[PDB]
Amino acid sequence: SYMLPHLHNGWQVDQAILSEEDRVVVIRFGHDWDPTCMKMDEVLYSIAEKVKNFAVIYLVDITEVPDFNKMYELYDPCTVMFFFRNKHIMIDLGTGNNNKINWAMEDKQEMVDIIETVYRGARKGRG
Numbered sequence: 001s002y003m004l005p006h007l008h009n010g011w012q013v014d015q016a017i018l019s020e021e022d023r024v025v026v027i028r029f030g031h032d033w034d035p036t037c038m039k040m041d042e043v044l045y046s047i048a049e050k051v052k053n054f055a056v057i058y059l060v061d062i063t064e065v066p067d068f069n070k071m072y073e074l075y076d077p078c079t080v081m082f083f084f085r086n087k088h089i090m091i092d093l094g095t096g097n098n099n100k101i102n103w104a105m106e107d108k109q110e111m112v113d114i115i116e117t118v119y120r121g122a123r124k125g126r127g
Contacts, residue, residue, distance in 0.1 A: 004044050004057065008064035016058060018086045024122045026057035026093075029065070030078030037078055039104035040093055046108040047115055055119045078102050084122040091118050 007013055007027075017025060030037045037059070044057060060067075062074050079100045082091035094106025094114050106114075 004041060004048065004059055006059040008060060010066050013060070013065065013067070017083050020056060022056055023054035024119055025083045026055060026080065027083060028059050028078070028080050029062050029067070031063070032061055034078050036102060036104035040080065040101065043093070043106065043108050043111045047111050051115065051119050055115070076102055078104070082118060082122070085124060089122070
């Protein structure tokens with residue numbers, strides 16, 4: 001089961017997005033034996049509990065998760081995505097130059113920066 005909570009089901013995903021009960025939510029799409037995921041996951045452990053009370057990340061594999069396959073939906077190595085207010089928002093784990101985080105590169109540095117603006121920015125309130 002590991003630490004970083006995962007998810008692979010339309011019922012758990014469609015419900016998880018709305019079942020935040022905190023603030024935001026992070027989701028990763030790729031493979032269990034993916035390199036880009038190994039790097040991102042490494043940072044998660046350091047940037048998880050730090051604000052888990054507000055944000056709720058969830059790993060996902062582009063094979064077990066029935067997120068509309070169509071026929072050849074697969075093509076990209078890996079990538080991350082954030083969800084807030086039950087909406088799909090494009091937020092990179094820690095863009096170093098450009099393009100989503102498919103190659104993975106930021107560690108607990110670029111991440112903490114983005115997560116700080118996302119977790120705090122995607123609050124929707126008046127705190």
